[PDB]
Design a protein around this ligand. Structure first.
Ligand SMILES: NC(=O)c1ccc[n+]([C@@H]2O[C@H](COP(=O)([O-])OP(=O)(O)OC[C@H]3O[C@@H](n4cnc5c(N)ncnc54)[C@H](OP(=O)(O)O)[C@@H]3O)[C@@H](O)[C@H]2O)c1
Ligand SMILES: N[C@@H](CCC(=O)O)C(=O)O
Length: 418
């Protein structure tokens, strides 16, 4: 009825665990976050009043290392959502082999109605409230929905003020501006990882992407950068893009820069010059070789699963495919890249930023790109090898890999004896 996010995450975990040999005690440990912190966030309003907000900080598991995750400023943010996202972040950092755990934060607030001063006060108060459970080697927050690098800089400054500069205060939080412990390649991290996964999938399927067609659903940051990087690096033809308002179809190809400029000038991609106007419900079924949903979740359902014609479906967004759609697409011979494997580039570049901050030495764009390429290629090939050995779904193989790594880390620490 309500389909609670945490229940769905636990159900997914059980489905995954049924495909591998894991002890009952370890599964019960994994079903519950290891630490949940709920705090009040009082700030001073611009009119002089004091408003109290509810903040969350869930650390699902830290067997493999310090927990990692973003902070969401959404009016419809709940504890369940934070717990489910921390659980998913655990597997996200485990599949791509990072020395990280799972974490997530969130404040129930509408940031659209907050001023800059009030936003800074909210960030500083959240840091003051959750200081006792965060740190460079304990919990590293990150940008997420309705949060940008400016809030990251404010949060890092507040943490440094509280910590009295007794250590690497830069590394307590990632996604910061380049002037203060920032990292090169952060803006295009997720799309770069998605492009690397798409290239590896094409390599696995034996099809060259040069001259091929790609359709991207959702033209936000991730969708725009995915289309642009595909067109440049992969040599593919961006045939169709879309947003919430509508979509664009052009067999001859779309220039991502031109489409982004049009969207910026008119607020939407609708009615692009010299292009056919469509919507998402027929965009998802266009004849393409790579489809990259980079928008609101749950766009592929059993209704439209049988009509998908893409050879590769790169789940850039967070869970855009339902399990029934997963089964239907696997039956059709379509190679799916799991959601928490395709967009693992953002957390990988976040890890690179944390390493740079901890070490005090900062890398270049080429070094970050090469390291990200190596990490994403290795993770995808491990997942595909499991998918080829166990004769299971790609999402199932990614779950097996991540849960196996976490379980091995737990067994090594002695947390679970079986
Ligand atoms: C930081 C988060 O990353 P992000 O950059 O991806 O966030 P983001 O900028 O909000 O990305 C959302 C994108 O998906 C679009 N969208 C919203 N609802 C949609 C729907 N129901 N169907 C298809 N597209 C939809 C948005 O279009 P709009 O910009 O028109 O809302 C936007 O293009
Ligand atoms: N928010 C992104 C995916 C999640 C992420 O960026 O980490 C989208 O829905 O397009």
């Amino acid at each position: 009825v309500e389909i609670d996010p945490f229940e769905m995450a636990v159900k997914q975990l059980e489905r995954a665990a049924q495909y591998m040999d894991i002890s009952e005690e370890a599964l019960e440990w994994l079903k519950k976050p290891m630490r949940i912190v709920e705090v009040s966030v009082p700030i001073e309003m611009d009119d002089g009043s004091v408003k109290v907000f509810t903040g969350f900080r869930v650390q699902h598991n830290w067997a493999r290392g310090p927990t990692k995750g973003g902070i969401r400023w959404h009016p419809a943010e709940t504890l369940s959502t934070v717990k489910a996202l921390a659980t998913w972040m655990t597997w996200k950092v485990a599949v791509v082999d990072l020395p990280y755990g799972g974490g997530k934060g969130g404040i129930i607030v509408n940031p659209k109605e907050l001023s800059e001063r009030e936003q800074e006060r909210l960030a500083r108060a959240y840091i003051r409230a959750v200081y006792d459970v965060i740190g460079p080697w304990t919990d590293i927050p990150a940008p997420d929905v309705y949060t940008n690098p400016k809030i990251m800089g404010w949060m890092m400054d507040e943490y440094e003020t509280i910590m009295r500069r007794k250590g690497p205060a830069f590394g307590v939080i990632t996604g910061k501006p380049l002037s203060i412990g920032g990292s090169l390649g952060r803006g295009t991290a997720t799309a770069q990882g998605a492009i690397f996964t798409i290239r590896e999938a094409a390599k696995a399927l034996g099809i060259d992407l040069k001259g091929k067609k790609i359709a991207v659903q959702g033209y936000g940051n991730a969708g725009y950068y995915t289309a642009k990087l595909a067109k440049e690096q992969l040599g593919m033809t961006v045939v169709a893009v879309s947003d919430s308002r509508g979509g664009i179809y052009n067999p001859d190809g779309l220039d991502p820069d031109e489409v982004l400029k049009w969207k910026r000038e008119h607020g939407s991609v609708k009615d692009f010059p010299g292009a056919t106007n469509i919507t998402n419900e027929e965009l998802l079924e266009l004849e393409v070789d790579v489809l990259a949903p980079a928008a609101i979740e749950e766009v592929i359902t059993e209704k439209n699963a049988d009509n998908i014609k893409a050879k590769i479906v790169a789940e850039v967004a967070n869970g855009p495919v339902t399990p029934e759609a997963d089964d239907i697409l696997r039956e059709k011979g379509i190679l799916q890249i799991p959601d928490f494997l395709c967009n693992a580039g953002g957390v990988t570049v976040s890890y690179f930023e944390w390493v740079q901050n901890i070490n005090g030495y900062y890398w270049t764009e080429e070094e970050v790109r090469e390291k990200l390429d190596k990490k994403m290629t290795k993770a995808f090939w491990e997942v595909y090898n499991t998918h080829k050995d166990k004769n299971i779904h790609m999402r199932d193989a990614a779950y097996v890999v991540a849960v196996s790594r976490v379980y091995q880390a737990m067994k090594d620490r002695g947390w679970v004896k079986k």
